[PDB]
Ligand binder design. Structure first.
Ligand SMILES: *[C@@H]1O[C@H](CO)[C@@H](O[C@@H]2O[C@H](CO)[C@@H](O)[C@H](O)[C@H]2NC(C)=O)[C@H](O)[C@H]1NC(C)=O
Ligand SMILES: *[C@@H]1O[C@H](CO)[C@@H](O[C@@H]2O[C@H](CO)[C@@H](O)[C@H](O)[C@H]2NC(C)=O)[C@H](O)[C@H]1NC(C)=O
Ligand SMILES: *[C@@H]1O[C@H](CO)[C@@H](O[C@@H]2O[C@H](CO)[C@@H](O)[C@H](O)[C@H]2NC(C)=O)[C@H](O)[C@H]1NC(C)=O
Ligand SMILES: *[C@@H]1O[C@H](CO)[C@@H](O[C@@H]2O[C@H](CO)[C@@H](O)[C@H](O)[C@H]2NC(C)=O)[C@H](O)[C@H]1NC(C)=O
Ligand SMILES: O=C(O)CNC(=O)[C@@H](CS)Cc1ccccc1
Ligand SMILES: O=C(O)CNC(=O)[C@@H](CS)Cc1ccccc1
Ligand SMILES: *[C@@H]1O[C@H](CO)[C@@H](O)[C@H](O)[C@H]1NC(C)=O
Ligand SMILES: *[C@@H]1O[C@H](CO)[C@@H](O)[C@H](O)[C@H]1NC(C)=O
Ligand SMILES: *[C@@H]1O[C@H](CO)[C@@H](O)[C@H](O)[C@H]1NC(C)=O
Ligand SMILES: [Zn+2]
Ligand SMILES: [Zn+2]
Lengths: 696, 696
């Protein structure tokens, strides 16, 4: 009665290697399911996080390398451009010869860097303006500085595009880094030294004298100004409510309530917005509807920018433009980021060149890379199986509504309607394989050179912003895929109300026709339930079935959701992470993902129980003394067998909206009654507390 | 009748995942046993060769990391010094903060580097001499330049040490690289560029002017000088006969035959040899017996060294010294080797720091690191079982002498006599665990500092050469192990007539108590046969049972041996390696290893069939539709599932005395009648040619 086939041996052996039978499952199920993984695997020098989830990304990068490094001649122009971009990225010999010339030759286009110019006031200072300066970095290179301008979807009109105004990102991962005290001591030191090291090497290449006394003082003005901008930004905890962030107004209204003064002159919003939208031939009148997401940031931005000169402003705006480009120059400019990269990620060396180029080509040509990947790794028979698995889990969430006691009847009536209206995207769009002409025309305006890699990334920056800004007057494409097929992940779209499962995640240990059903539901089954619950967490619940930001909750049901979810904010907020110096996780930022974990793990187990009583039990796996009910939670846990670097542990707490894999297993199973039933966990154990959170 | 234990499950899955069931075992058994490995495992960026053999080493380095990183309160002095050395090695922050100062401060000790010296003739030219320059690089750092000097075991008196004089190695892997054409074109370009880069970095750190043209002139003379020296060395194919290399002559006879003139003055051999041995306070008279291995090289060296100045010679001798230390300095000096390292190994990055550190401490403190390894990963119950396996294969070799028709009766008895006198070493020396005083006393003179890694490696260089030079008047210690315990390899000593099997290799897939006997005989059993046959190949046969280079072969048997061995010279010479760009294997320089492979697997298989006759058939493995006779050859082949980088396939084809793993499987099994019977291979198939080579 025990399976003995080839696939059952390879499946069971993988589970036996990762787990540790000597540990108790009810004391620490992470160390029970990953005890063997922790002893065997060591964090590579190029990885800030290493887990079975990250290994799958590396194995996918391998397949991308085989289909790109091989000039298969009989390829369409799109695939040729995809490979030519790949070759230009790997030839370090040609890149190391230019030094920093390709970056220094286009600096006059972004009004130059004042620290690296002999006389900047006479050459650029006369025609300088904060409007055209921010616009050039935005419209041409996609670098959002000072004010973040981008054309996105209308939250209350999912069919239209609209201009968004929000606070920008920072040179450091988060605004918490600009405290520069305690755990952020080395980061700020390596960040200012990153400026100085680049400032020294740039002046040396232009034949200008090295005035080291001015560089140490002028670059601290860039840090002093950016700390004030970080202090003026709004915390990410106060930005999780989409209803509170939506502030639509006209451009003339933006000029009235959010005025700015640059160099003693008032800032012109119409001039700034038109300097961006003129690149795509679109005029922005004063009655243009614009959604402002950070109104408090723009208010605090006025008293700060009036205290700095145009030279001090261009030093910060140009530095943000250069710090993301020194890694594409010669080795003399690549290694200047090592100290800065080590402070934020702990990696001693950058990842493999072919690995970076495989991700970059997959990021800028996701339809062509996905074409080669699905033809060389993805099996076509996986479509109908995942389609049926979604329908099973979709129906599970519908039936689970009546079991939930924290919602009234009217809220569940249309909460089911949103779940019924969820559309699905599985595998890859069919037009990237059957229509070579459409794929060729998609990258028609792209022209890559074999020995001009820096001119190809600049062309990709201009092409990305040009494509995005042109959608302002156009409707939202209903057939557009939000991701490529060569991605080991899953997604949910609040504005589209759809769940997307690319081919990169439809593989072991998530899903396989040759692995047990207890592992499929424990793998991809929890994934499907995760993305479906994402339409009902602290962010997606504010969107209706049509992707519009409309309140369909009653006051009693909406208040109970905040009460049910408050349990998880305190649970994950009390988790002390030993890899981050005992610091705790953010129970507010990780809330949306924790709701999808605890909700998805229960729906996957429910859909699996419905499959067992319908199709019968399964034969046990040889070599492991666990029933298929216990194998369900084992496969779920073994997905996140991993460990973090100390530097990235502090980074993921403030930047990653997910919890670490250690606590994604602990927190989700602590609130799972079906987990404690399968392993017969005693009362008040670490994995079976009497107080359990429950939302979906 | 199928094994169902947890160890059998992961053992069978390893066999299933590595093999390719779609391939034909009789068309290409390498593809049949490794086709799955080739798709599953890809060469890392830090590996010139990646195979199942190298993975066992990569896994062992992890165990070394765990037993060396964290200090413990009960550690003995020897363990404390190893961890002190390891901690000094991993601190990349302290290493980068020193730049090249540890090397610049040391360079005067080797008469400096003329190209990187402000005035080499004024500082070192007065007291410079070739006798002292070669001697200091030999006795203090182990850098053998121009003339190779070392104190080793007498070939004909295995109980005595004696001075050896031989041709040195080169900066490139072999003399063939100095053709600098075709597959060697890139190596020479990066070689000279390597010299120029280091010459620029050292002068820049010294604050000296940089002359691009002058450095290029002096470094091309270095290549020009080393081209002649390489052209003067005897080919490796002409150095496999130990009887033809043994030329014992007095020091006065060396001065007469191999006179050298340098800078117009005659070279004093007595001055040179005594400048080395004075470091251990040993005088070398002119009656001293010396073994000269390369008389043709020393003669061809006469007209070469006269045409070069003291600056030209020192520019080459110091460069050989510097090129091996540049990877121990800051990152700037590490990156100067990138183009050179990629040309010879294909690696785009240096391996992980902790991996190099663990391997370095394991190499300089093998008894301390071996102690920490066997106490943490090696089961002592393995030694008795391996002792029993050696006795079976040893008896099989003696019984095989009756089947050999190419030997007369009196030579068979002498072959049996040497086989009976073979000593064995299994696991680890007992002293490293049971005698803490002896282990601490071994490293008494070593004293490491926490933050001076370069000072520690230089101290290890003096101590390493000092320990061997002081053995000149000492008898060869018979109990002294020839390898550390934490080594994944096996060794045979011709002078000791003993076979060694360290604990690192007594592990899966070689040996395991939880492993099928068919796999143990195909794994460690073949290794034991490989080691015993080493004493009877084209080199081992020239030594008697006590390890002395004496002729015990009749003229007919010696002629018949060379005829039987000539078969394998053609068989392996005709193998064309695709990874090497179509180059063929060196059947002469790989003859000994090919003989040991062919003879060994036949002994292990015959020993396995004798075991099955007495103990009975074993249980089949799950998911594998193969019998145990087939699993014998399968486990033997799966040890060598791997691939080479093209840059290193050219390297290993001239340096590695072993054949590639691809052809060790093909070549050995092509000559195995039992293999073609076990898999039912038709005659004249690729794996079953009707003409088969046979020695042992
Ligand atoms: C990678 O880039 C290098 C440098 O641009 C290329 O090497 C050049 O190749 C052209 C081919 O005609 C020669 O004329 C140049 O003299 C070469 N320059 C150097 C410095 O060697 C190289 O060809 C590129 N790699 C590939 C695969 O195209
Ligand atoms: C935004 O304002 C700038 C200047 O404030 C405008 O640039 C001027 O353009 C006119 C002709 O279009 C020139 O005669 C001026 O010399 C320019 N001024 C400077 C300082 O260069 C720019 O045209 C405005 N943007 C839009 C879209 O009208
Ligand atoms: C390698 O060394 C050999 C000698 O050991 C060189 O052969 C000599 O070449 C010169 C002319 O260059 C002749 O006059 C001699 O008669 C040759 N002698 C022998 C024994 O062949 C050979 O040229 C050297 N090759 C290189 C590349 O340096
Ligand atoms: C060292 O030199 C001596 C003398 O030149 C060599 O001995 C001679 O070898 C030849 C054979 O070619 C004989 O004909 C002579 O009678 C020998 N003379 C003496 C005095 O022994 C000796 O072979 C040389 N050794 C090496 C290793 O080349
Ligand atoms: O963003 C990441 O780092 C990984 N992505 C994730 O953790 C989610 C993205 S919502 C997808 C997923 C859900 C459930 C199980 C597996 C995977
Ligand atoms: O040194 C090497 O590269 C590999 N060493 C070997 O191949 C031999 C050392 S001669 C040991 C061995 C024999 C047979 C099988 C496994 C291992
Ligand atoms: C941050 O800004 C607030 C007002 O916006 C101000 O009161 C506070 O002092 C600022 N803090 C820092 C560190 O600049
Ligand atoms: C590494 O060296 C630096 C500088 O010498 C020192 O500050 C640091 O403490 C060292 N690290 C360890 C682990 O000893
Ligand atoms: C070699 O000769 C030099 C000069 O004659 C002398 O100073 C030196 O001591 C000699 N070497 C030895 C080892 O005696
Ligand atoms: Zn998620
Ligand atoms: Zn060998």
């Amino acid at each position: 009665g025990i399976c003995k086939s080839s696939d059952c041996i390879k499946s069971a052996a993988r589970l036996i290697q990762n787990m540790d039978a000597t540990a108790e499952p009810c004391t620490d199920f992470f160390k029970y399911a990953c005890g063997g993984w922790l002893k065997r695997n060591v964090i590579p020098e190029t990885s800030s996080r290493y887990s079975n989830f990250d290994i799958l990304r590396d194995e996918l990068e391998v397949i991308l390398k085989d289909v790109l490094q091989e000039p298969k001649t009989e390829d369409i122009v799109a695939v040729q451009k995809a490979k030519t971009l790949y070759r230009s990225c790997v030839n370090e010999t040609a890149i190391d010869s230019r030094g920093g010339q390709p970056l220094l030759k286009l600096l006059p286009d972004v009004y130059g860097w004042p620290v690296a110019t002999q006389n900047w006031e006479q050459t650029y200072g006369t025609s300088w303006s904060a409007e055209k300066s921010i616009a050039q970095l935005n419209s041409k290179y996609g670098k959002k500085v000072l004010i973040n301008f981008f054309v996105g979807t209308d939250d209350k009109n999912s069919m239209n595009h609209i201009i968004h105004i929000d606070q920008p990102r920072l040179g450091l991962p988060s605004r918490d880094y600009y405290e520069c005290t305690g755990i952020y001591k080395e980061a700020c030191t390596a960040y200012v030294d990153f400026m100085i090291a680049v400032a020294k090497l740039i002046r040396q290449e232009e034949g200008l004298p090295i005035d080291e006394n001015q560089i140490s003082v002028e670059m601290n003005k860039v840090m002093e100004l950016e700390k004030e901008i970080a202090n003026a930004t709004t915390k990410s905890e106060d930005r999780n409510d989409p209803m509170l962030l939506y502030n639509k107004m006209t451009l003339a209204q933006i000029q009235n309530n959010f005025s700015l003064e640059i160099n003693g002159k008032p800032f012109s919003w119409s001039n700034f917005t038109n300097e961006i939208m003129s690149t795509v031939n679109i005029n922005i009148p004063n009655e243009e509807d614009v959604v402002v997401y950070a109104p408090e940031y723009l208010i605090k931005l006025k008293p700060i920018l009036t205290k700095y000169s145009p030279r001090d402003l261009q030093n910060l705006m140009s530095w943000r433009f250069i710090m993301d480009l020194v890694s594409s120059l010669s080795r003399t400019y690549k290694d200047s980021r090592n100290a800065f990269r080590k402070a934020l990620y702990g990696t001693t060396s950058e990842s493999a060149t072919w690995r970076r180029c495989a991700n970059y080509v997959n990021g800028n040509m996701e339809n062509a890379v996905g074409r080669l990947y699905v033809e060389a790794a993805f099996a076509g028979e996986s479509k109908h199986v995942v389609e049926d698995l979604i329908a099973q889990i979709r129906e599970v969430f519908i039936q689970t509504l009546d079991d939930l006691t924290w919602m009234d009847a009217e809220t569940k009536k249309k909460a089911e309607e949103k779940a019924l209206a969820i559309k699905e995207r599985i595998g890859y769009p069919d037009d990237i394989v059957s229509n070579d002409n459409k794929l060729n025309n998609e990258y028609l305006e792209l022209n890559y050179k074999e020995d001009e890699y820096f001119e190809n990334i600049i062309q990709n920056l201009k092409f990305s912003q040009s494509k995005q800004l042109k959608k302002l007057r156009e409707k939202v494409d209903k057939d557009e895929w939000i991701t490529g097929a060569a991605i080991v992940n899953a997604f949910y779209s609040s504005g589209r109300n759809q769940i997307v499962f690319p081919a990169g995640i439809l593989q072991p240990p998530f899903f396989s026709a040759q692995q047990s059903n207890s592992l499929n539901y424990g793998g991809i089954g929890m994934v499907i339930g995760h993305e479906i619950t994402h339409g009902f967490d602290d962010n997606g619940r504010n969107f209706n079935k049509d992707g519009d930001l409309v309140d369909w909750w009653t006051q009693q049901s909406a208040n109970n959701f905040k009460e049910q979810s408050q349990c998880m904010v305190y649970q994950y907020g009390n988790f002390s992470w030993d890899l981050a110096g005992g610091q705790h996780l953010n129970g507010i930022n990780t809330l949306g993902e924790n709701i999808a974990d605890n909700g998805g793990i229960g729906q996957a187990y429910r859909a699996y129980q419905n499959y067992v009583k319908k199709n019968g039990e399964e034969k046990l796996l040889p070599g492991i003394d666990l029933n298929h009910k216990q194998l369900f939670f084992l496969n779920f846990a073994q997905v996140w067998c991993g460990t973090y670097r100390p530097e990235y542990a502090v980074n993921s707490i403030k930047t990653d909206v997910h919890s670490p894999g250690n606590f994604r297993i602990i927190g989700s199973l602590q609130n799972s009654v079906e987990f404690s039933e399968a392993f017969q966990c005693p009362k008040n154990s670490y994995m079976n507390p009497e107080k359990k959170c429950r939302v979906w």
